């Protein structure tokens, strides 16, 4: 006694048993099928015409067969698409990237079906690097708008959580391989299932992501001294790591080369930094700090919006100060 959704791209179907389980307050597998038919009709335009016909309001989540009724009407229409693709109609593009409306559906589907218990994401010791804190849906999609990435570029997160910042970036651009390094335990135990389902949820919806891995262990292990020195783009949530934990990140940031861009909550370096013979040790001599625009309509616990600060390793200034001590 289950519910079946036939794959529009010919992959293995996703089966959800009855009764349909509840993941959290606002994302459950019963309503998730309503959006699944809603977003897959956005995928195949001929499939959208099949659900404009004869799909009336009168279907409810309490009834099994009535939820099955739209599902059985979906399963009849997928067979109409696959026989249409065998003729002169070209198939849907498989190697494309999911749009933000479809990256809305897939990642939350990975967030729900992999991470069963979100309460276990909150079992930590506070005021520590073990403090769990995730990112909003828009601000990572804001970085997709505002920050340019390529294949020589490599997006690696520090303290990824369940890793949805890498997931929203590895699906966005084409970096060669990603790392999400996790000192926390319980979102890393979910990251094994976040890795399995998401690679499968790019099979069922049929889009492309980049190569990624969410890794458990130490980001302050001494292997990652040069592995950070291999990284181009580094995301870090330094609100409550502790500054000596951030100072040991400043140890690993002494070995980074040109073009490194760090997007972080608490500034390593002030916006109004100035180089003099007192702050020769400080980190603002080599990177410029600019504040990315915090989200409109987003109030945090303090009352100010969450500020992530764009950096850029630019060693231009440091020789210029050394030149302007000769000058005049």
């Amino acid at each position: 006694l289950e519910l079946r959704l036939k794959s529009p791209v010919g992959a293995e179907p996703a089966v959800y048993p009855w009764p349909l389980p509840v993941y959290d307050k606002h994302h459950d597998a019963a309503h998730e099928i309503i959006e699944t038919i809603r977003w897959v009709c956005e995928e195949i335009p001929d499939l959208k015409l099949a659900m404009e016909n004869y799909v009336l309001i009168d279907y409810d989540t309490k009834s099994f067969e009535s939820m099955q009724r739209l599902c059985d009407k979906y399963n009849r229409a997928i067979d109409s698409i696959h026989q249409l693709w065998k003729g002169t109609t070209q198939p849907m593009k498989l190697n494309t990237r999911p749009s933000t409306g479809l990256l809305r559906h897939i990642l939350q589907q990975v967030y729900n079906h992999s991470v069963t218990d979100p309460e276990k994401l909150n079992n930590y010791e506070p005021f520590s690097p073990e403090v769990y804190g995730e990112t909003s849906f828009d601000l990572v999609a804001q970085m997709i708008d505002e920050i340019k990435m390529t294949d020589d570029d490599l997006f690696v997160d520090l303290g990824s959580g369940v890793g949805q910042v890498v997931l929203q970036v590895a699906a966005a651009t084409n970096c060669k391989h990603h790392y999400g390094v996790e000192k926390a335990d319980i979102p890393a135990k979910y990251a094994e299932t976040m890795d399995r389902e998401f690679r499968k949820w790019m099979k069922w919806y049929g889009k492309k992501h980049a190569e990624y891995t969410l890794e458990r262990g130490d980001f302050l292990s001494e292997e990652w001294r040069e592995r950070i020195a291999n990284t181009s783009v580094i995301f870090v949530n330094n609100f409550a790591f502790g500054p000596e934990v951030d100072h040991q990140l400043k140890e690993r940031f002494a070995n980074m080369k040109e073009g490194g861009r760090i997007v972080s909550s608490k500034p390593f370096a002030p916006l109004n930094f100035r180089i003099n013979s007192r702050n020769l040790s400080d980190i603002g001599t080599i990177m410029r700090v600019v504040e990315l625009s915090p989200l409109k309509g987003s109030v945090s616990w303090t009352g100010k919006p969450v500020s992530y600060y764009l950096h850029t390793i630019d060693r231009t200034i440091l020789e210029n100060y050394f030149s302007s001590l000769k000058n005049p």
Binding site: S281, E319, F322
Partner: protein, 74 residues
């Protein structure tokens, strides 16, 4: 012999040494014409990092050859 020191910033200096000189006397003479703090200077010869008391004759860099300078932050 004279050597050439090519940096990461595109700027290359024309610095004149002896073939027997130590890097410490070079890093002092880099502090002459460039004034960059030698305790924040970091030199590389071709995968062999220059150490202070070590010479050129330890490393046997040829005349009119190319070095690499890195700006380390203390």
């Amino acid at each position: 012999m004279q050597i050439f020191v090519k940096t990461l910033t595109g700027k290359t200096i024309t610095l004149e040494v002896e073939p027997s000189d130590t890097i410490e006397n070079v890093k002092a003479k880099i502090q002459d014409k460039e004034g960059i703090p030698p305790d924040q200077q970091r030199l590389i010869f071709a995968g062999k990092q220059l150490e202070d008391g070590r010479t050129l004759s330890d490393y046997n860099i040829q005349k009119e050859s190319t070095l690499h300078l890195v700006l380390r932050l203390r």
